[PDB]
Structure 1
């Protein structure tokens, strides 16, 4: 008849799951649990409404739809890009979450890891193969939760002050899922008092925004931020620029028959097919760029009462443990998406003129003086025109500006204001990587190791890569359990604003180093803001 392990009652009703095989043994999975009412029709752009209770048994036996989003077509059929594309049908009916728990169900409350996917706030899905939670749960005996949240215009189009499209509803989707975890994770054996958020890129930025938003902060205990931070130059937008982008998108799809009554404008937007909005999404950006996304969280005083930078500097973070880090080559992946002279299919040995033009694309919407300051710091004036050095320098510009230095600033300020911080740099290039060698260890390619994907027998990772993945899963689960990645062996010291110690994650044992590109990040974090103001 029924497997009692695969049957769970939550607040809304009864669920039926599936028993998953893993290389290490069985795991219980409840995939596609509805946590909100479908944000369709009149509910497009609105905050999520909690899922109404149901009679009978909901089959949570497969991943639900991917939230409607742009699909990348830069390199069709190429594994390096297709691995990030939707692997389920697109739909606005997409507010579902997933729970993995050990088989049999834990008998005592078990620490919970909650994953928030990245994707520049315009893409992503909890169903991607690289976010498969079965290996972590089996290997480390935690409960793992992941949720879908609205992206692009559907999640982050904002007419600030309006009731019809207030913005940040994609973040409210995440918060509702976190509230669902608090109310229901115990039914799966999870400990609601030991919830660790973790996420990568825009997912890491989301984690940070939940840290800085008091209504979210009560819903979790620890945080992990991989290759992303809320204080990046891409992760938030001001109210005026958000209104300008939303108004231009409406104009590009014929609404209204520009601006005017917000209620009328949104009502017209709600009549457009979802794909019509997606087709014009990228056109509302003020200039050609890399690492910039049209509809992102808006700083409007509500979800974020101030800029993440201000909230970080003004925050008391005693009692908080965070784990943060970057990959070795954060900037390289983004260059083939607009920087002149770049391609995955050649060595991208750019000229000096291409480097100077690339700086304006990688640092958009700054004064000519600011761009000259960037050129000053990233030119080797003994080799100003060397194509190989210019390629790596532009990668450093984009990676430092968008990822490394925002992460370093967050790590240093949190540590100085009471938090226990652990920092890493991920330095192993996967044997299965399909991107060219010049990209190094690109953005996003630590995730598969954190999730234990090398343990999948159908994949062809080396044996030592499987050992490496098991080590990383152990660090992450140790942190979730205790707030300390170290095993209760070379030790991982906390990051502090003074000593600035971090560890290198690679096939070799831990190596302790100092400074997350300290000289470069002093420019981005300490001087360049002063320049932009004067």
Structure 2
């Protein structure tokens, strides 16, 4: 019917009606937003999609951008839920729109979701990103886009116009430009556009906040388990060159314009098969192709722009999960497995510190180890495992997020912080991993409401609470209800009081400090030490 037929600036779309226990939602899946970045357009900033004849079929998710498909635990849902669920294609720059079925006659606010995956993986078609429940429950419009990952999104020869860098970020910015122009055709309000994302998606949200050409395309920002100032999310120019020139040597590619032309002649699968082999430490925490500090998108290091920005007028929702680090340990760290209790040894632990804190001196590593050993039980394997889980989690997610949250708060922003502390009753990982990196998203998106998944009565209620908080924030920059007794339940995060809430089944609880003591080491002392040595 005419509810599923929409015309945007480029032409006609035909969407699909999706069902929700609450009721139906109108969905437009796989709307092209850039000309396919293929052949000579590989590694280049995206070009806007030109108008098309006829009716585009937006009834299903388009393709996934090329990436390594994880095969650590084959057939295991804990890993499979995150793997690509469409064909891989360099023809992948498509976005998706969910909107209420009585299409809003008034302009409703817009959530835009940027998926994470450490800049080396990810897809908007993953099942845990289904916008239908968030839309049907809170009557906002939800948009999500694909953006190039891996070398396709982030190979850079700083200097050249052929491989400029950060084109995966520009993919996102283009889709936000698209939202500006077309969201109103679906009921959306271009003037209330809230960015949210997790992991590299959250780091992405962070860079749009620091990149002036993007700061005009959205108004509020949610960062979940990621920060642009994290040790894994940017790379220098001179290093970006070495990594590009190395991938080229690996793929058999004999100046800069000549380098890119050879890479462009290689099947996309050949680049994916070598991009992990670029760095000797084949680590998840220093993946080869991430955003570059070139002076373009980022006029300075993310740290530099944070410490110097006026963030008056910005509201920000920010948080981590309880155990950020445990998911990364099974992907590398020596002694670990989803299939036993991963009872690490001291030397396995000393070794793991180097894998999760890569590229720090020897003195810095000893500092980490002395800082995180329990000197009354120096060789307890369980305690050691938890310690290492904290070392990588604190260093890569928590202390970066914290450092950003306080700086934003201190320099004019209005911040609300959380820690996600619910372990799903469906969670297929082992119990020692706890609440792992990535496992709040199911709840933000209202997945427990899907009748076919097997979540708890109490868990559906929790997901609705969370959706309420997020939509509240989208609407007003304030997750609290505009009208309620005992009204300031969720207080703002400030550099002093450092209040956050804990999100779980029990009613909101305020706590002080996001690993305040731990993050003093990472944000304040460790740099001084890397310096004077």
Give the number of aligned pairs. Answer: 526
Per-residue CA distance 1:86-120 (angstroms, 9 max, x = gap)? 00000000000000000111001100000000011
Deviation for aligned residue 1:289:
3.1
Structure 1 CA distance, aligned partners of 2:285 and 2:198? 14
Per-residue CA distance 1:49-74 (angstroms, 9 max, x = gap)? 00011122111111000001110000
- Tell me the secondary structure at the aligned position of residue 437 of structure 2: coil
Per-residue CA distance 1:484-503 (angstroms, 9 max, x = gap)? 00012x70000000000000
Residues 276 and 282, structure 2, Cα contact 8 Å, conserved in 1: no
- Tell me the secondary structure at the aligned position of residue 298 of structure 1: coil
Deviation for aligned residue 1:139:
0.3
Residues 290 and 335, structure 1, Cα contact 8 Å, conserved in 2: no
Structure 2 CA distance, aligned partners of 1:528 and 1:310? 17
Structure 2 CA distance, aligned partners of 1:44 and 1:347? 44
Residues 469 and 479, structure 2, Cα contact 8 Å, conserved in 1: yes
- Partner in structure 1 of residue 522 of structure 2: 524
Choose which of 86, 94, 97 in structure 2 pairs with 1:96. Answer: 94
Report the TM-score, using the length of structure 2 for normalisation. 0.98
Structure 2 CA distance, aligned partners of 1:312 and 1:283? 32
- Tell me the secondary structure at the aligned position of residue 339 of structure 1: coil
Per-residue CA distance 1:192-251 (angstroms, 9 max, x = gap)? 010000000000000000000000000000000000000000011111111111111000
Deviation for aligned residue 1:288:
4.0
Structure 2 CA distance, aligned partners of 1:10 and 1:63? 18
- Partner in structure 2 of residue 47 of structure 1: 45
Per-residue CA distance 1:361-393 (angstroms, 9 max, x = gap)? 111111001101101110111111111110000
1:26 paired to 2:20 = no
- Tell me the secondary structure at the aligned position of residue 355 of structure 1: helix
Report the TM-score, using the length of structure 1 for normalisation. 0.98
Using a 3 Å threshold, how does the CA distance of structure 1 residues 46 and 290 change in structure 2: closer, same or farther?
Answer: closer
Residues 290 and 339, structure 1, Cα contact 8 Å, conserved in 2: no
Residues 114 and 204, structure 2, Cα contact 8 Å, conserved in 1: yes
- Partner in structure 1 of residue 266 of structure 2: 272
- Tell me the secondary structure at the aligned position of residue 19 of structure 2: strand
Structure 2 CA distance, aligned partners of 1:506 and 1:392? 21
Residues 155 and 168, structure 1, Cα contact 8 Å, conserved in 2: yes
Per-residue CA distance 1:230-276 (angstroms, 9 max, x = gap)? 00000111111111111110000000xxxxx1111111001100110
5+ residue gaps, structure 1, are 256-260
Deviation for aligned residue 1:532:
1.1
Structure 2 CA distance, aligned partners of 1:382 and 1:468? 39
Deviation for aligned residue 1:32:
0.4
Q: Please give the root-mean-square deviation of Cα atoms over the aligned residues, in Å.
A: 0.7
- Tell me the secondary structure at the aligned position of residue 24 of structure 2: strand
* Structure 1 consecutive aligned stretches of length 4 or more whose deviation exceeds 4 Å: none
5+ residue gaps, structure 2, are 483-487
- Tell me the secondary structure at the aligned position of residue 67 of structure 1: coil
Structure 2 CA distance, aligned partners of 1:29 and 1:438? 39
Residues 32 and 97, structure 1, Cα contact 8 Å, conserved in 2: yes
Structure 2 CA distance, aligned partners of 1:153 and 1:147? 18
Summarize the alignment of residues 391-406 of structure 1 with structure 2, pairs less than 5 Å apart.
Answer: 391-406=385-400
Structure 1 CA distance, aligned partners of 2:331 and 2:26? 39
